[PDB]
Amino acid sequence: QPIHWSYQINTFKAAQSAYYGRNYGRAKELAVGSEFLTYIVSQKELDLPVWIRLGKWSSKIRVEVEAIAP
RNA sequence: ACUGAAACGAUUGUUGUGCCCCUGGCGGUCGCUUUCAAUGCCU
């Protein structure tokens, strides 16, 4: 669930590595100014990682996690 | 296959050409090298 979000539209392209050149696209990315909320459910205690990566660009998320007590 | 795998908004580009810190202007005006003096003394 998105709690706070913002979007950046930033272009990306393929490089001209050769000295001579004769495609490209715009990504609507979710931006650094954003936070989302999820829930995990398990039969057992879980060593969840405090960093994950998502999406087309293997993009860093800080996970801060709390166990819901009985 | 994470709505996945790879992912350069890149290449070239002189803030540039012309331009007198210029034009006018008296270091000027006033001013006594002045004042005093035995070529002396004796043959």
Say which DSSP state A69 is in: -
Rounded Cα–Cα distance for residues A29 and A10 (Å) = 7
Between CA A57 and C1' B19 the distance (Å) reads 57
Positive or negative, the CA dihedral A58, A60, A13, A11 is positive
Q: What is the CA radius of gyration of chain A?
A: 18
Between CA A55 and C1' B3 the distance (Å) reads 8
Resolution of the solved structure (Å): 3.1
Using alpha carbons, list the distances in angstroms from residue A34 to A14, A17, A22, A40: 28, 35, 38, 20
Query: What experimental approach yielded this model?
Result: cryo-EM
Between CA A25 and C1' B5 the distance (Å) reads 18
Contact present, A31 and A8 (Cβ < 8 Å): yes
